[PDB]
């Protein structure tokens, strides 16, 4: 029970939905292209968690709801991601917010994100 925030962020990276890291996410957040807010609350500010929290507090549709608390868990899951490794030879950076642009999949653990999303 993160196993369902590896099979729906693996699929949107791979499809190139996403965006990654401020800038591309609240440009994604304010415009109706981009359906989720899953992020760091270990921000080293407080206006990036009431920025991304206001954009989920824009309400038509696209309900952005929060799940993880972290930037180095999230250089792996997202994937930027070196090769022949184990789980990090990679970036060691933080893709912090990964905003869902319709993804690139349909059903297996993407139907438990549309019973723990909204049933909270």
Partner 1 sequence: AAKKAAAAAKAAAVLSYYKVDAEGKVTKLAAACSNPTCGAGVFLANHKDRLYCGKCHSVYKVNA
Nearer to partner 1 (CB atom), residue 58 or residue 70:
58
Of 30 and 102, CB closest to partner 1:
30
Give CA separation, 91 vs 40, 72, 84, 100, in Å.
17, 9, 14, 21
Q: Is the dihedral of CA 85, 91, 94, 100 positive or negative?
A: negative
Q: Does residue 31 interact with partner 1 by CB under 8 A?
A: yes
Quick one: 53 or 109, whose CB is closer to partner 1? 53
47 binds partner 1 (CB under 8 A): yes
Classify each residue of 33-65 as buried b or exposed e, where b means 16 or more C-beta atoms within 10 Å of its C-beta.
ebbbbbbbeeeeeeebbebbbebbeeeeebebe
Shortest reach from residue 96's CB to partner 1, in Å:
12
In sequence order, the 6+-apart residues with CB closer than 8 A to the CB of 103 are 8, 11, 12, 15, 17, 110
Q: Pick between residue 23 and residue 107 the one whose CB is nearest to partner 1.
A: 23
Provide, rounded to whole angstroms, the least separation between the CB of residue 53 and partner 1.
7
What residues numbered 54-113 form the site for partner 1, per CB under 8 A? 54-55, 57
Question: For binding to partner 1 (CB under 8 A), which residues are involved?
Answer: 22-23, 26-27, 30-32, 45, 47, 50-51, 53-55, 57
């Amino acid at each position: 029970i993160e196993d369902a925030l590896k099979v729906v962020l693996r699929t949107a990276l791979v499809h190139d939905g996403l965006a990654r890291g401020l800038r591309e996410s609240t440009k994604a957040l304010t415009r109706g292209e981009a359906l989720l807010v899953v992020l760091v609350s270990s921000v080293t500010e407080a206006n990036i968690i009431k920025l991304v929290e206001g954009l989920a507090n824009d309400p038509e549709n696209k309900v952005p709801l929060i799940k993880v608390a972290d930037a180095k868990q999230l250089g792996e899951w997202a994937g930027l991601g070196k090769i022949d490794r184990e789980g990090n030879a990679r970036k060691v950076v933080g893709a912090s917010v990964v905003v869902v642009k319709n993804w690139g999949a349909e059903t297996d653990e993407l139907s438990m994100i549309m019973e723990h999303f909204s049933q909270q």
